[PDB]
């Protein structure tokens, strides 16, 4: 009867996954099967396939956070985050629009702030910044050279990110990556690392001392990206879900989607990997399923989340959890 979280069993390295295909832009498979696919195409260390360890299988079993946790080797911090927000559309639709049939002004403002974000441009911004960081670390063999290479291209590109503080989440993103300091990972050599991207959907009204309106309909001033840089301050994100509007209404607090480092230029053709919930086949929610969605399917989101952040972190180049190409389903 226990809806307790269980860790999926170990899958032999030769066991091939059962076939599955996307339907209307999204594919899904039970987590036991996705482990088989992950071991075939994502597990390589220096080109050598590996079995998903007991620890990784435990991380994965926690739900949508598990895919990103396993692929990046770290529980997501969301320290370096980007998003796009049309300030002019938000200000105009506030001072020109009107609440629809059945909306509090706190609900109208919350929705307009939600619809003013552009998740395509937000993912596009994180794309271009991650490319600058990868070029900076290409031939840099110490962090000092990486920071010098990074600032050089940002200044020549007239990117406002150049003026970030030396200890900001942006400039400290590489040195704060645990695998960067590990002797089997980066070994303090930026040229052995690579920038990767995942996304987080979450709720804006997370201040427990704020009005119930913002907890139920959103805080328009919360989690807006800074001008010029597009950086989102994720320090006040505390994994707090949207508050219910009526009794019985349940909301999920966040959602994590793994992009990696795909080379496909079409944002709409990029694949995002996420899970529905934690693994409990003997319990209420059932077994965890891993979803592989096209970008527009992922960025469609839900009413649970009014915010989207596109995060940059780093993994060693020796890994294969962020390959150039990601294929939905199997084979």
């Amino acid at each position: 009867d226990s809806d307790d979280r269980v860790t999926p069993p170990a899958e032999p390295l030769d066991r091939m996954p059962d076939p599955y295909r996307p339907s209307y832009g999204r594919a899904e498979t039970v987590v036991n099967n996705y482990i088989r696919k992950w071991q075939q195409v994502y597990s390589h260390r220096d080109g050598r396939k590996q079995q998903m360890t007991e620890e990784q299988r435990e991380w994965l079993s926690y739900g949508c956070v598990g895919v990103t946790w396993v692929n990046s080797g770290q529980y997501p911090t969301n320290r370096l985050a980007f998003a796009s927000f049309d300030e002019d559309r938000f200000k105009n639709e506030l001072k020109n629009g009107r609440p629809r049939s059945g909306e509090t002004r706190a609900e109208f403002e919350g929705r307009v702030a939600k619809e003013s974000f552009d998740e395509e441009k937000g993912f596009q911004r994180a794309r271009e910044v991650a490319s600058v960081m990868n070029r900076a670390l290409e031939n840099a063999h110490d962090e000092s050279a990486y920071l010098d290479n990074l600032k050089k291209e940002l200044a020549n590109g007239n990117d406002a990110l150049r003026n970030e503080d030396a200890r900001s989440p942006f400039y400290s993103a590489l040195r704060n990556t645990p695998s960067f300091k590990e002797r089997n990972g980066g070994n303090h050599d930026p040229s052995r690392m690579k920038a990767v991207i995942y996304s987080k959907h979450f709720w804006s009204g997370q201040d427990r001392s704020s009005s119930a309106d913002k907890r139920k309909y959103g805080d328009p001033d919360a989690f807006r990206p800074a001008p010029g840089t597009g950086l989102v301050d994720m320090s006040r994100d505390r994994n707090i879900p949207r508050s219910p509007t009526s009794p019985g209404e349940g909301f999920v607090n966040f959602d994590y989607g793994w992009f990696g480092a795909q080379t496909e230029a079409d944002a709409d053709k990029t694949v995002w990997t996420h899970g529905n919930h934690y693994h409990a086949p003997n319990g209420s929610l059932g077994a965890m399923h891993v979803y592989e969605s096209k970008f527009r399917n992922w960025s469609e989101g839900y009413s649970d989340f009014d915010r989207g952040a596109y995060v940059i972190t780093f993994i060693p180049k020796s890994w294969n959890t962020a390959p150039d190409k990601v294929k939905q389903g199997w084979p």
Binding site: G63, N239, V252, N253, G275, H277, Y278, L285
Partner: peptide
């Protein structure tokens, strides 16, 4: 703590 695992 705050539960994760996407149970609403």
């Amino acid at each position: 703590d705050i539960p994760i695992g996407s149970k609403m």
